[PDB]
Amino acid sequence: REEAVVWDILDEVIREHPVLLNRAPTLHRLGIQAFEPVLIEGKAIQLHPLVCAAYNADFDGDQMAVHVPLTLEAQLEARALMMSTNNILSPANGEPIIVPS
Amino acid sequence: ARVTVQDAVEKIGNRFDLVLVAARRARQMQVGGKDPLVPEENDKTTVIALREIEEGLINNQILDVRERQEQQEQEAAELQAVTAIAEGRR
C-alpha cells in the first residue's frame, strides 16, 4: 500500500548501511566501491562527480548495479576495506585517483 | 556518525583485524545484547563498535578477559547454584 508509515521506517533501516555500486566492465579494484545511500526521489542513481573517473563513467546513459552487503561482517568490510574514502590512491601507482577532473 | 576508520585502525595497525574485532564486538550489542560502552547517538551497532576501538576500551585482548571472566563467573553461578541441587536433595 506504500502507507506513509513505511517511508519513516525505511529511513532508519538505511541509517549506516553501505551499498555497493559497481559498473559493468570492472577493470581494476577501484571499480567497486561502497557508499552510504541517501534517499532521493526519481529513478537515477546519483553519484559524486569526483568518483566518476574511477569507474570511468560518463553520464550519458551508463548504468550501474547496486548490491547490498547483507550480514554483519559484510557491512564492515564495506566500511573499512571498501569504503569510498579509503581509496584516494590507485593501487597501480602512488598517484591520486580523486583528482578534480 | 563514522565516515572513516583511519583513527580506529591505529589502535590495531591492520585493516583485516579491525574488521574482525569490531565484527564480533558488534554482535554482543545485537544478540545476547550487552551494553555499548560509548554513549550512542542514534547509530547502528556497527558504527558503535567502531567507535569503541578508537578509544582503546575494546581490542582483541580486552574482548576475551571481558568475557572469559564471565564464562567462569557463570560457572561460579554453576557451583554456587550447584548448592541448589546440594541442599535440594538432602
Binding site: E73, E77, L81 | F16, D17, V19, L20
Partner: peptide, 19 residues
C-alpha cells in the same frame, strides 16, 4: 585464504595434526 578470511585459516591449519 587471503584478506579477512586469512585470519580464520590461521586457526584451521593449527588444528589438524594437533588439538
Amino acid at each position: 585464504p587471503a584478506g579477512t578470511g586469512y585470519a580464520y585459516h590461521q586457526d584451521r591449519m593449527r588444528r589438524r595434526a594437533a588439538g
